[model samples]
Target chain A: CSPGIWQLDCTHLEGKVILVAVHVASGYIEAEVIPAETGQETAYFLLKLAGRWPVKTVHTDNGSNFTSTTVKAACWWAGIKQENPQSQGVIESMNKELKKIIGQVRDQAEHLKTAVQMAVFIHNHKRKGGIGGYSAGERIVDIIATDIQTKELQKQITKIQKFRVYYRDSRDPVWKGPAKLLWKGEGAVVIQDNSDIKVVPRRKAKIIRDYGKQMA
Target chain B: CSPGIWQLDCTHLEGKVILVAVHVASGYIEAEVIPAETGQETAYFLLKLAGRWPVKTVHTDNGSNFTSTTVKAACWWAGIKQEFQSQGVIESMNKELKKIIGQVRDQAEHLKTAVQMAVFIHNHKRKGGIGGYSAGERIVDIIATDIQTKELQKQITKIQKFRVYYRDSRDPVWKGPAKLLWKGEGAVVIQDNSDIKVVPRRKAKIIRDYGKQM
Candidate 1:
């Protein structure tokens, strides 16, 4: 939500704060430049963006704007739950990167709004190591591949591989050397090497069968 | 290190594999093409490069070559520890970047050079959100201001002019050695127009202040 260090001393900006909202799962970011860090403004901005995005949770540190009733009511109205403070880690990391990029380009502060917007766009399009080379925009806008279909599959494969490595290293007998396991997690299905299978919750069991058929 | 996926099924590179070593701190990469993933060759190559780098640990997944006694002994001889089987982070990064690498292979030697070049670009150009800068820039502690790249161009221009006028082009030579002091290194040019540009072929110039350190 904010940083320990303030914005680069851009006199042209005159102490305007940039509000950033990121989709935690997808790494998609939306930002807007505003004159003040008030509750109503932040709430309104987040609400507007939430209307367009599939944002289900708002995770933030104890920033004043986020703590105010205005923002809480806004999140409630939007059906977005306030995520635990621990979940704010990803957004905070994003803030650091945002601040650094913005600081480096501080010489162009007269047009900082456009600069920030461009940064958000660039960030969204950039590939993420954590997300199997897929960009945030790819996760969001590119629906032909669909985040649920492709990213989930890739994640499942990684999880299965990790599980196999763990068992092989630990020589654990419970999993019996990665020979046939099924696990369920929260809107995806994962089947790996016929020995590992996972079904993400909130998704129909039929989806797993469908996905298996597709893979076949 | 090996990416989970091999190079694109290019017919030209039908029977070769590349052994790559990456400096974890600097994100610098060195690569070599070999006939196969033999333990001895990979160990020797990694050992030689590792000696020159600030590598304290060699992290690898449980590949047969990596787990072999030859590789383990090489690491032990160099006073470097080997970390196996818990390398998901490196593997994930490798997978993310696997495609860019696969596209650059043609001949074994060329493929090795290409892999090194690709790694250089990866280090110097690609921005990591965590670091807020490119890996090369982060490693160098130099943000690659426009003035630095332009300074080189201007120095080259000055040398060109001096060459035309002066008799002794040998003593007051501005251009240093042609070969790279550090292999597989490159620079990124930050343009005045805010466009990031790449000078792929440019090598590091031995300068007065910092060149002595090198």
Candidate 2:
């Protein structure tokens, strides 16, 4: 019935067209408000979010909006395989869930956007029995982490930022790694030895580096 | 002196702030206007554009903008490595380019739009020493085609703009491209591959994509 379970579709809400994509395995979904259901719009939205999520393949019904040249070009560029004539069951259920919440506030156009955004947000956070007690959002994050080395790279970012901050504020006492410190109106002393410490204010305190060592 | 040469930086244009990522190897640049130079804004802009470009590492100056929890979270989420330094020749060039853009802004909301347009034009037309090709054309092959692709691109843009206008009826003025498309509707060909045909009135045809005929 489906290729890989990552399905995409479009529907109208409050006279404004909205495109939605769902990772059926995790039940994680993403939605965007669009002016029209064109190929370019579909591709643009998908391409923008690819970095945030892992999109291996896409399944959609055979519609002109999903068949345009721009959409084809974008999908090819992004290395996303497409499967046509996707079953409507997966995405249709999602659209129906969104419409239930949407119909209550259909008259207020501005609120409709926020309502859909909140609906997707809540849907992602909902825990599914199929995923072994993991929320859809958590499952999606786990999937992307394996898809790309985001967690390892994030460590690299932290080390780089620490190096930069240590050098830029080399003269600050925070780098000295003392017992406890104070800042002007910062409120309370920051424990330097704690590895979880983030953002040492410039006004006061020494920056605690890894392994409880001072920058100096 | 650098780590594999895919470093990028951020700068401000006029009163607006822009996050620009330059691929040192190709002289290719990608930029986006941000609300502020906070860590969240920096990460938001960079993370969103990472799909369009290959950003192995980002090189920005040492400031609070790149050291915030939100920004760090974003960088980790996007898998982008980062670097920091004081100043560079790129920053100096950005200042001069801003002056050129500042000369044309006659309205308040026009500054950011003008800056984005400037970036687009520069990417598509600016020449580099690497075999004299535009960065846009090099990075994106679709823009490098002959007149047919260019015409098609213009048509797509016009159709997008008309949709915006159709929804936003309270807009102040009608732009140049829409007016041109309206007047020369039938003159341009729709250019369908299998069955090439031209609509008698282009305005009527623009709506044909949505199952409507006039």
Best by TM-score: 2
Q: Deviation in angstroms for B100 in model 1?
A: 48
For residue B43, what is the lDDT in candidate 2? 56
TM-score of candidate 2 versus the correct structure, residues matched by position: 0.37
Go through the candidates in order and give the clash count of each.
Answer: 2, 4
Specify the poorest-scoring 10-residue window by lDDT in model 2 chain A.
A176-185
Candidate 1 stretches greater than 4 Å from native:
A1-14, A84-90, A104-110, A128-132, A141-216, B1-214
- lDDT by residue for model 2 (B1-214), tens: 2322454556644666676655554444555566667776565455445433435577656657666876666556446666673235666545444554565455224565445444534443555443335453332322122223545878866565442112122545532222223335334433332333333442222332343335
Query: What TM-score is obtained for chain B in each of the predicted models?
Result: 0.47, 0.52
Q: Which lDDT tens digits does candidate 2 get at residues A1-216?
A: 221347777787557888877776555677766657667667666664442343567765586766677776656655667762253564586688877856653553334654565456556655555354345655544443333344446655555345322312345434533333212235334333334454454544434544346443
DockQ scores of all models, one per candidate: 0.01, 0.01
lDDT tens string, model 1, B109-150? 344444444554455454634333545432322212222444
Candidate 2 residue pairs in backbone clash: A174-A205, A174-A206, A174-A207, A175-A207
Model 1 docking grade: incorrect
